[PDB]
Amino acid sequence: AQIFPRNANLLSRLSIFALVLLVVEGILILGVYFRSNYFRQVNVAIEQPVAFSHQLHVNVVGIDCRYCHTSVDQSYFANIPATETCMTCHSQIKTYSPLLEKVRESYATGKPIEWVKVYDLPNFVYFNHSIHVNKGIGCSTCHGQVNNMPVVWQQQALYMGWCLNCHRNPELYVRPREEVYNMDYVPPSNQLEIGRQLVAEYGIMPPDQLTNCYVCHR
Amino acid sequence: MQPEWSGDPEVKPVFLAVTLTGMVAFLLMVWLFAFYW
Amino acid sequence: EAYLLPGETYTSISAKIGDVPLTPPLKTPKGWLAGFSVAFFMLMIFFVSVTWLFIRGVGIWGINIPVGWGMDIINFVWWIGIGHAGTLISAILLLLNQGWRNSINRFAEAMTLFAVACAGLYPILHLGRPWLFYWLIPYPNTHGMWPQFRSALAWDVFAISTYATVSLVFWLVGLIPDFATLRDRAKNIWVKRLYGIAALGWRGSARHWHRYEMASILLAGLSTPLVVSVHSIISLDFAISQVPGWQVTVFPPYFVAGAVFAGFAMVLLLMIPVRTFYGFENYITLHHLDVMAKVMLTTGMIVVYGYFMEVFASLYSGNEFEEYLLYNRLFGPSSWAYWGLLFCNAVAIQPLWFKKVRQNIPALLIISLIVSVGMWLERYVIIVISLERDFLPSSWDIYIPTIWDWSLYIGTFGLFFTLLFLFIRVLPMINIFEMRLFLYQETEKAKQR
Amino acid sequence: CTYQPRQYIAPFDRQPEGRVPGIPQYFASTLTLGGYGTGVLVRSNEGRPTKVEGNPRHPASLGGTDLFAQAE
Ligand SMILES: CCCCCCCCCCCCCCC(=O)OC(COC(=O)CCCCCCCCCCCC(C)C)COC(=O)CCCCCCCCCCCC(C)C
Ligand SMILES: CCCCCCCCCCCCCCC(=O)OC[C@H](COP(=O)(O)OCCN)OC(=O)CCCCCCCCCCCCCC
Ligand code: HEC
Ligand code: HEC
Ligand code: HEC
Ligand code: HEC
Ligand code: HEC
Ligand SMILES: CCCCCCCc1cc(O)c2ccccc2[n+]1[O-]
């Protein structure tokens, strides 16, 4: 009463409340920014120098995924296709076109097509495509419906926890090993009984083995 | 002995406000750190 | 003697303590200005050393493959052990009902807070990837990773965070009616609100004093096992290891005793200039210096007992690694640290038994400086010499510190003194209340005869 | 700011015939110290030598090499 006015008590209590809320909001803003789709480049159509259309080339043309990603069932690296593979068909279809001008500019010189890596793992991670494909994990469960993508986006961020989710509960995501390249496959109504059956059939290791550090990191 | 604010009609409204703020902040932190991905 | 000289009133105590703050900045003493200039120059040295460390790496120091912990960890344990005596005066002396805490606890707890502030950067500074100190904290991440919590460094995270937080909380609680006194004693209307919002309208109410005394008692009875657990955990970040100099089980009370020893050395070394430069001879007395040196002598005797325990373990064991640990300390390439440690922690404490030496001020200053040097040598002997020579003799090397960890040490000294000079500028060095309450208690004792 | 930079990728213009992308490939070569060659199995990761191993079919190799052939 000598110094501070009448509303100083309410002002001090509201200041303590607003400081606690501001700390919580700052922690929340930092967490949302580090989990956001902009930061993790998720659900954004990453632009390519040619703007290759997976939707056309799979849902319309009908090219199998192993025609272009030839090394996906044999090595860790799914094959980014060659200009030879593109010009195998594009020596006749839609020639003298400005959107295939970059592909025609390649294969005459040794200069490749500098595609942008949509799914970029940070080089200590060591994903293996061959064991994941051969152990009954389809492309749609981990890359999305790329057969309908005009421009390829990241369906999810490649979090360590998201990887360990399927390494600890694979029965929610395993599929007959013959439905891996099928983009029309959907999991059934129950899926848990057949997931446990397929884990036992393919000998999928327990979550301790699959959650070992040197499975992925190196 | 009794507390300082004993007998004040604003005590249970401000306790419900503090507990509501705590449970909203807790549920929001749980959503961001567990069910956001 | 007495812990309060006669001739003091409550208004005289309030004026004589609160008039060293609340002075205009044009009336700031030249001694404070010179000390703050030296402290700010060494803080610039701190900034230069930290910047070059962050630019280049932790390889600017002398640490190598066998000695991965060096002067960074020595200065960490040194600076975190400075704060134990201030926590003791703030908490254990309140628990024990000792009347000499009333004139040293504010400055000693401020020294504790600034020493913990200097020693909390040292994990982040030595970390090697300094920006990932939060991975040691249990925090929610997208990886699903956790800290191990079986290591002692996770316990160090929890202990250092709890020690800093509860020490700051107890210091602010002990400052709130001093904030009320400064808010009452201020002259300018805009510096009233500086201490008014920190006093929160204290009013000195007897209903508020009951809850205040209960909270201070419970904070003391929580901060005594807090500080013992913090220095036990800082002992444990060597004692949980299999290193022959570090797998020693008397380390938690030994580190408690060494921290209280070095803390009261620094406390005496900073009371004595404060006592002789401010008018605090009536408050900080020769009895205060005598009992602080008595606690120094007791805790230094416990550390000497810990040295005897380590020497007994080495001689009593048939273990070749314990025998070579004793041999390496006695006659190794780093035996200077052990011999100077024995001189500075065993020879220099036998004068402290004597009453005239205990009452003497320059002897106390020399003894406190020698004890601080010898405690740095103790932490050198514990860490560096044990890490230098290990189980495999092929993995033996010498730890030679560079100029950069010495520059960081001088810089953290400057940060500590900068924070201390800011504290003695804007805040009272000693508690305005609980010393007028001490005067009332001594008046009641004189009335009771 | 994002989590990572753009990270461009660079495929071939013509795929190699006997190469699967991502599978390291072993070639039997010969490394000489003082003119006396020893058989080495040098690993080509993507068309480039990265690790020298020993050639078990070779007399002075037997799967093991020396430090000079390893540091070639
Ligand atoms: C290996 C692990 C060992 C576990 C150690 C546990 C010790 C913790 C004790 C905390 C001090 C509280 C005393 C309050 C008080 O001042 O008591 C007053 C009486 O007033 C009261 O009515 C009590 C006030 C509230 C008390 C509630 C305490 C909350 C529970 C603590 C949370 C800890 C967790 C683990 C549950 C008078 O009594 C005293 O003043 C006596 C104080 C005795 C100090 C003990 C000093 C021992 C130092 C050794 C420390 C050991 C290391 C391992 C920590
Ligand atoms: C330092 C790390 C360990 C701290 C543990 C210390 C114990 C703190 C809590 C115990 C409280 C004891 C009850 C209070 C009390 O009686 O002490 C105050 C007492 C009496 O003071 P008056 O009220 O009568 O007035 C006097 C001044 N006006 O004062 C004392 O005499 C102090 C008691 C000494 C305590 C002894 C503890 C020693 C710890 C030894 C640990 C073992 C080490 C083994 C290596
Ligand atoms: C989930 C477990 C996946 C499945 C099933 C398939 N892929 Fe994959 N793909 C996945 C990750 C985590 C990554 C990043 C790897 C890296 O090091 O960045 C990829 C990457 C690709 C790529 C880019 C080239 C490469 O890194 O190999 C392509 C062309 C690709 N994936 C295609 C692809 C196809 C067609 C798949 C089904 C047969 C397939 N991947 C399986 C995750 C997963
Ligand atoms: C043969 C099976 C093909 C391969 C291999 C690739 N493409 Fe193709 N492409 C093919 C067809 C039949 C069509 C559609 C023609 C039509 O009339 O609709 C396309 C389309 C494209 C386009 C669009 C051209 C346009 O619409 O004018 C582009 C830019 C394109 N394809 C690029 C492309 C690249 C870079 C390829 C190698 C990865 C590639 N295609 C493969 C036939 C075939
Ligand atoms: C050749 C005509 C292809 C076929 C058939 C499929 N993909 Fe492809 N894929 C192709 C190219 C030229 C590229 C790089 C350019 C781009 O748009 O990304 C890719 C890349 C992918 C990716 C992105 C991987 C990355 O760069 O991070 C994915 C996820 C991918 N391909 C998956 C995929 C699947 C599941 C397919 C079968 C339905 C498929 N691709 C067909 C070329 C061709
Ligand atoms: C579910 C859709 C998965 C996700 C997401 C990831 N992985 Fe996986 N991984 C999965 C299966 C079914 C298996 C089979 C292993 C078995 O014994 O059944 C694996 C295995 C791997 C391996 C092989 C290592 C080994 O088996 O010893 C690697 C190197 C691997 N996974 C890497 C990896 C990474 C880096 C991931 C995050 C991008 C990841 N996997 C996700 C299923 C799934
Ligand atoms: C494959 C299934 C993995 C296993 C097993 C482990 N980690 Fe992982 N790690 C994996 C991925 C896909 C990522 C990238 C996460 C992202 O958000 O992009 C990581 C990353 C990490 C990190 C973060 C690295 C950084 O931000 O600089 C850490 C700290 C990490 N991984 C640690 C870690 C440890 C210690 C593991 C064993 C217990 C571990 N990961 C398992 C994939 C996988
Ligand atoms: C947010 C508080 C975290 C600060 C303390 C970090 C704990 C910590 C971390 C370390 O790497 C250490 C290495 C050697 C010695 C002590 C250490 N401490 O205490």
Integer distance in angstroms from the first to the last C-alpha of chain D?
42
The 3-class secondary structure across C177-202, one letter per residue, is HHHHHHHHHCCCHHHHHHHHHHHCCC
Number of CB atoms found within 10 A of residue C250's CB: 16
Cα-to-centroid distance, D17 and ligand 8 (Å): 55
- CA dihedral defined by C90, C91, C97, C98, rounded to 10 degrees? -40
Closest residue on chain A to C198 (Cα): A12
Binding site members of D for Mg(2+): 7
Distance from CA of B30 to the nearest CA of C (A): 10
Closest CA to C197 of A152, A8, A59, A89: A8
Determine whether the interchain pair D3/A74 forms a contact, defined as Cβ–Cβ distance below 8 Å.
no
- Give the ligand at the shortest distance from the Cα of C76: 8
- Which amino acid would we find at residue C301? M
CA distance C304 to C310: 10
- Experimental method for this entry? cryo-EM
Q: Is C146 buried (19+), middle (13-18) or exposed (0-12) by CB count in 10 A?
A: exposed
**Helix C71-87 and helix C403-426: axis angle, to 10°?**
20
Contact assessment for residue C173 and residue C223, using Cβ atoms and an 8 Å cutoff? no
Residue A205 is classified by DSSP as P
- DSSP code at position D7: -
- Computed on alpha carbons and rounded to an integer, the radius of gyration of chain B in Å comes to 15
Task: Tell me the shortest Cα–Cα distance from C206 to chain B, in angstroms.
Answer: 12
**Residue A4 in marked binding region:** no
State both tokens at B21. Answer: 């703020």
Within chain A, what is the greatest distance between any pair of CA atoms?
A: 92
Alpha-carbon gap, residue C135 to C61, rounded angstroms: 24
Element holding D28 (H helix, E strand):
strand D25-32
* Other beta carbons within 10 Å of C255: 29
Q: Which atom of ligand 3 is nearest to the CA of A123?
A: 17
Mutation choice for ligand 6 from A130, A132, A217, CB with most ligand atoms inside 8 A? A132
Amino acid at C324: Y
CA dihedral C200, C201, C202, C208 (to 10 degrees): -100
Q: Is C215 in the pocket of ligand 1 (CB under 6 A)?
A: no
Judge whether C170 and A185 are in contact, CB under 8 Å.
no
Which residues fall within 8 angstroms of residue C299, CB to CB, at 6 or more apart?
A: C257, C258, C260, C261, C264
Q: Can you tell me which residue has the tokens 């904030």?
A: C179
For chain A, positions 9-38, list CB contacts with chain D under 8 A.
38
Whole-angstrom distance, CA of residue C232 vs CA of residue C252? 4
Residue from the list A3, A4, A35 with its beta carbon closest to the beta carbon of C142: A35
Q: Which of B14, B16, B23, B32 to mutate to test the interface with A (most CBs of A within 10 A)?
A: B32
The Cα angle at residue C94 between residues C90 and C95, in degrees rounded to 5: 125
Using the mean position of ligand 5's atoms as its centre, give its distance from the Cα of residue A103 in Å. Answer: 16
Whose CA is closest to C175, among C427, C439, C438?
A: C427
Q: Which of C117, C92, C120, C123 is nearest to C105 (CA)?
A: C92
On whether any CB of chain C is under 8 Å from the CB of A33, the answer is no
How far is Cα C230 from Cα A159, in angstroms, rounded to an integer?
Answer: 36
b/e per residue, A12-43, with b = 16+ CB within 10 A?
eeeeeeeeeeeebeebbeebeeebeeeebbbe
CB A202 within 8 A of CB A135: yes
Chain A residues with beta carbon closer than 8 angstroms to that of C145: 160
d(CA C104, CA C100): 8
d(CA A147, CA C181): 75
Q: Are A139 and A180 in contact (CB under 8 A)?
A: yes
The type of residue at D34 is: G
Q: Are strands D8-9 and D25-32 parallel, antiparallel or unpaired?
A: unpaired
CA distance C52 to C278: 39
Q: Using CA atoms, how far apart are residues C387 and C384, in angstroms rounded to an integer?
A: 5
